[PDB]
């Protein structure tokens, strides 16, 4: 074999090298660290796991550091008790966190809450199963009318559409984790909560004070904030994470299918990568088969051209867990089989849209591509290739991010002196990697007299 | 607005005038009638409530008969109490009507259960879940060993996979429904449990011998030997219901999206009616809101091009119809809005793609169909056009029937004698529809000097 | 099948019925009378002797009346003796019609030469032979300095490439031989050295003065005036003839196959038809065969999109008439055999014309049948270069006989079209009759419906 | 710049360097040398001075031998006289080459002339003049009745329309001729009257066995025999030459244009070159300017996409060879100007070569440099009538001549290319020093990398 790449959210269930072994030969691409939960010894065990695991089997895979990010909820209740709000009440949120709550008033964990939030601003809560309207605001209490019954529970997340939180892109503990990413290695960044392109640069600028200035943000939008700025989001990061569950929470249930897809595209065109997370087979935590419609909505979602596809609880907390990567596994495959490429004035642009046009009109399997820092490959997987890209680069890190993108197979070589001599290594290594045999044509794509970050050259070959 | 169909099934919430005439209203087209559930008095009373609407509004709607069709479930357990079946375990299923079952052999209702069956097949329950795998058969008993875990309960589904059941087309009861519909002159029969191009057959012959000759039939796709016959299913219809969670327990998650593709494709190539239907927005049943993932399973579908969208449940048995109807009919026109045509030799083929070719380029807003038995304006209606389709006919029946295909105004007139009269009368007629201005293009679609079933002429008007 | 219609120029080598009747065999088309030579009677007497052959034979054909047009030619010499000029020698003409010729100077017979010419401008005499640059402008003498050396001759021909020529738009004799094509009721008038805009209006209304405001007018361009307002004299004629063989003496040769190929596209682009004139087979007046280049020429212009060919001279006083239509007739047949049509790769009249003949391709129809009035619908099927025919019925006798020059179209004269099923009635019954078409054959019947003349706005597609 | 080739016959009028140098200037790209006439001295006389000139001022161009070829002629007659010969007479060729002949018979040079030709052939003498049909064969006499009336001369030629001429691939002359092209190093070879794959084989074999294996054999398509046999003549040779008014004389005209546009497509696919020959603007032997008809047949012959245009007499030996040489330019050069690149609207270089120009002209590349040893990737991206100029690096002084040829291409001579990254680097630096393009211009570089020769493979881009 498939292209589009797995996602794995590892946990306790599969912590182990023994599970991690079996997950990747499932179809698991990335391990993906849930900073929500876990102490640093117990995610520091599961890298050195995986990176054993890949020196005793010399397999590759990627390692995604999730953060926690900010966030509004609210606090507790008299004796932990759910209470019920009633549509049409009057119900208050305090800025006083000291403040224990019921059915009349509740506190909130951000001070600033009465201050971003004006008067016929809706709030949600928990996941939107509440909902209110703001009728006035005095000092630190905010007064709302609610909108439909429903329990109110403790420590519940809260959500305001089309309202610009002033929370800072980091948390305190996001700060800390970050710095934990950077001496540990890892190879991405999914950062949590990205409403503007300032948040994306605040945490850019923090891995750069600590040695992590070659790791990928992935810019999570998970809300509506983001979906408006998502343009200028994109520009600063180096992929997307498409949160179709937390964004169905702030839009309209209608539009959630086409912000994915307008995101997809965007995307795509941009030669960035963009994960499917959430809602995935969250049925498979408890059962040992997905449904039809979570089923579909995977291939759906690897339709709309995604570069990979993720795992949550279904892997980490989960009871079937290798059922559901090889399940994905299974429905990537099927799914990638059947797709075309698209293909559709930078230099680049038009170098790499050839050599995809030129593979297909000579039926080669493969496309070889000389890469240092990546774009290269990326540019290549824009058009959709049905060859597979086998990517030579001399960077470790740039090799292990590679796993992500669809349809690329990363190898780490020493060197490449010339482009001549790019070609002869690159027939060799076509040969022996069994995705080509001899006689086949091949595409190998590459930059030539040009510093990295520009491809310019497209050469064709028999094995 | 909107161009795609909602079919709703009605029940005791929604039987009444006051609410059909508000569904209506909120954007059903199509009444669905499921013969499963309700005597002819109650059906009858709906339709007529329905018939009565319509004559007070002056609105237009059809009238889809389902059936219950034929079926395989167990019977009886002692007590009437669940069963827990063990995997591994041996056991039995017996022609034997006659006896109580329990944890080692139940009973079926079909007598050729053993028959139909080999040793190796595979035995489904409970919509599956529990599969068994046949190994032995002794006269009336057949011998089983379970497969996974599960509670078996009284008067279950069963399904057998890739294996021909040798039921009739029809069981007595819907023989004698669909008599009932022949006389109260209902506009579709959407026939369950369809297999074999045969069965088909079958219900038109029966149809035709009480005078429902021209009663269109929707061969209900519910399993996998009528996936296999597909082709020949088709080509015997009048329109098919892909049923996709019936359908989810017969073949791999894997392949269903790729089924309802595949067979949406074949049918919009027939200028045959395709429907939507099961597991679109069950949540709807108990909540006044759909889930993200039902929203997108909707608009996914209708992008694969349905003709229309069913509702069961939802609207029959459910506690919010009238919001069911609404998200529906928002979700139609939000992916409508969006879709593009397909421009892809019979005469009727190109003329009609040339008639859509040509509304496009001249951004006509209508296209206006002479029909006598709807072909034309199914005919235009194949190239997704923009323009919406308003469909002239002399035939009542014909102008109920268009009204289940996508994006079709149908409108009943008392004569057209010649091709400029067609002319005349339909811009006369787009005027008053409210569908086009004075001054706008309109393309006008017809047959001249050829019998109908032919489609030949396009013209071009200005009003 | 052939398509490309020819035109035939007739005289006294080819004016008998006998020989008429022969021509059209061999695949003319259209008579065209040259009047830059012969008289009311004998011109009179063709038209004549084409009607008779039409009506005795049930051919159909057209009557072109091409103009004399306006001139600038030099006058006479001393002894009518051929003089000697000498590149680089100072020369000189005058508009006093008085004055014999001789070496130093000569006479020009238009009163305005010293007037639209401007110092340094061009001036060249006898089809080119001699160029000269005019050095100064002294009241009724233009003075100049010859270019070449060469033998000028006793009244001969004069062009001013890039001149703003100031002759009227019909010379006197081009009035009284329009009036005269009123008369005879032809279907074409060619008019001479269209320049402007204003020329044509100028001809339509003098045709419309005397009964010939059905006459379609044929603007010739000829010169470089004229094919800078090629855009606007388009617009205002009902098609262009164009004149290669003089456009060569007034601008660069480089340019001439250009201007040919722009103004072919323009006038297909408008629905109106375009000729091939001059310079065809000219090697056919003293010979029985043409030259290679001749037949290529041809070839080529067909392939540029032509409506029509025309022969003159070959045909008209050439000893080979016959032998000249015959292969004629073989390169228009042989060419147009191997073009293929145009399909635009909004109006309404655009979009439905054009959406027929792909139609007729997709199902390999044989015959596109029109109902046109005035003829724009026939055209504006001639467009896109069907492969089908079209057979193009009407009830207008002059529209029946123009479409004779437009490129693949088969007319034919009917009594009535009441409706339009009555349409697509009559044509399947017309065309099974004309051969052009058998039972189960495909058809595409273009017609307008329930609108005026002028717009075509409905295909329909027939089995017969 | 412009971009078509120009070929210039050098004869007397020409020949010194001052006027080869002149030529160059006004366009001319390579030398002919007509082998039907002049002594080895004097052609051997016209390369040297070629050669002094290119040595002297830097410019580089190529030299074609064109052989006489052989021949079918008739012989002497009584007295020496014309003789008139009357259509329906009886009339009578002789092998016997020492029968003098008078208006019953005549005698011929080829003495299979009674094999070759079978009763009902047509025969033609003088370019067609003459024609007569065969009525039957004895001995050494082929007997005949004439179909036209003409005076027959003294050593006419002779042609055998749709007619298998078992003549040699080479006469003697043609191989005494050829050595010496040998000697002298040509870059081309025109070979006459090509009919066979055999013939072809027999030229290459006959440069093999002397040293031009490297030569480049054009072959002269000039009667039906070769026509239809071109697609293997084609196959055989490096290159064709139409000579389409000698087909004028064997085929039938009407299909004389379709035959060069089958030829110049044929010759385009397979990446070899096509020149167009005969009857281009002869009207210049005499006059110093053309005609129309000559300038549009030539524009169109380049529309057609020919290689290169040659003149021949025209450059020899007329009264204005430099006229015609600079109109020729003139024409090129408007031309080409509006020509567009055909890009195949699978093998490697296809797929390579032609994805080059597409990406060439998405960019706006005004230049494509290419690295060629045998020339093969040159023309392959030639093929595509790129708007970017070729600029062709090789180590092969013989492959940077026959360059000159092709047409777009500006061959440069290189010490050396030792690897891909050299060429991009020496490419750029030569595409500056070349003033073809200037610093911040795109380019696109073609090469064939880890291969051999005749396979191009590699496309790069770069910025200057």
Not at 281 to 299: F, Q, Y
Not at 413 to 434: C, H, N, P
């Given at each position: 074999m498939k292209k589009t790449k797995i996602v794995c959210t590892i946990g306790p269930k599969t912590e182990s090298e023994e599970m991690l072994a079996k997950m990747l030969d499932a179809g698991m691409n990335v391990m993906r660290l849930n900073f929500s939960h876990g102490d640093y010894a117990e995610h520091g065990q599961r890298i050195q796991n995986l990176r054993n695991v890949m020196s005793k089997t010399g397999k590759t895979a990627a390692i995604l550091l999730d953060t926690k990010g900010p966030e509004i909820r609210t606090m507790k209740l008299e004796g932990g008790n759910d209470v019920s709000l009633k549509a049409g009440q009057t119900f208050t949120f305090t800025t006083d966190k000291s403040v224990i709550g019921n059915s009349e008033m509740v506190a909130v964990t951000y001070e600033g809450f009465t201050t971003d939030l004006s008067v016929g601003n809706t709030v949600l809560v928990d996941d939107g199963?509440?909902?209110?309207?703001?009728?006035?605001i005095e000092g630190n209490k905010v007064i709302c009318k609610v909108l439909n019954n429903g329990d109110l529970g403790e420590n519940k997340g809260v959500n305001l559409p089309g309202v610009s939180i002033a929370l800072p892109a980091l948390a305190e503990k996001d700060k800390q984790d970050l710095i934990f990413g950077c001496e540990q290695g890892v190879d991405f960044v999914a950062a949590s909560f990205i409403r503007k392109r300032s948040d994306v640069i605040e945490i850019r600028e923090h891995l750069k004070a600590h040695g992590g200035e070659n790791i990928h943000i992935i810019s999570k939008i998970e809300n509506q904030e983001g979906l408006?700025?998502?343009?200028?989001?994109?520009?600063?990061?180096?992929?997307?994470?498409?949160?179709?569950?937390?964004?169905?929470?702030?839009?309209?249930?209608?539009?959630?299918?086409?912000?994915?897809?307008?995101?997809?595209?965007?995307?795509?065109?941009?030669?960035?990568?963009?994960?499917?997370?959430?809602?995935?087979?969250?049925?498979?935590?408890?059962?040992?088969?997905?449904?039809?419609?979570?089923?579909?909505?995977?291939?759906?979602?690897?339709?709309?051209?995604?570069?990979?596809?993720?795992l949550s609880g279904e892997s980490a907390k989960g009871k079937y867990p290798l059922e559901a990567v090889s399940i994905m596994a299974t429905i990537c495959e099927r799914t990638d089989r059947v797709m075309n490429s698209r293909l559709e004035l930078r230099i680049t642009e038009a170098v790499c849209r050839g050599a995809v046009e030129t593979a297909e009109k000579l039926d080669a399997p493969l496309i070889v591509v000389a890469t240092q820092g990546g774009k290269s490959a990326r540019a290549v997987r824009k058009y959709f290739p049905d060859a597979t890209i086998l990517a030579?680069?001399?960077?470790?890190?740039?090799?292990?991010?590679?796993?992500?993108?669809?349809?690329?197979?990363?190898?780490?070589?020493?060197?490449?002196?010339?482009?001549?001599?790019?070609?002869?290594?690159?027939?060799?290594?076509?040969?022996?990697?069994?995705?080509?045999?001899?006689?086949?044509?091949?595409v190998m794509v590459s930059g030539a007299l040009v510093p990295s970050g520009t491809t310019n050259t497209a050469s064709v070959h028999v094995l």
């Open positions: 199963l509440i909902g209110m309207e703001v009728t006035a408006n700025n998502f343009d200028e989001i994109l520009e600063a990061s180096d992929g997307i994470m498409v949160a179709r569950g937390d964004l169905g929470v702030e839009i309209p249930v209608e539009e959630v299918i086409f912000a994915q897809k307008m995101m997809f595209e965007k995307c795509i065109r941009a030669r960035k990568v963009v994960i499917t997370a959430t809602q995935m087979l969250d049925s498979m935590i408890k059962n040992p088969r997905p449904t039809r419609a979570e089923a579909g909505d995977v291939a759906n979602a690897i339709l709309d051209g995604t570069d990979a596809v993720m030579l680069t001399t960077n470790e890190k740039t090799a292990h991010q590679l796993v992500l993108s669809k349809g690329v197979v990363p190898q780490l070589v020493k060197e490449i002196t010339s482009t001549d001599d790019f070609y002869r290594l690159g027939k060799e290594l076509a040969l022996q990697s069994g995705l080509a045999h001899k006689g086949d044509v091949v």
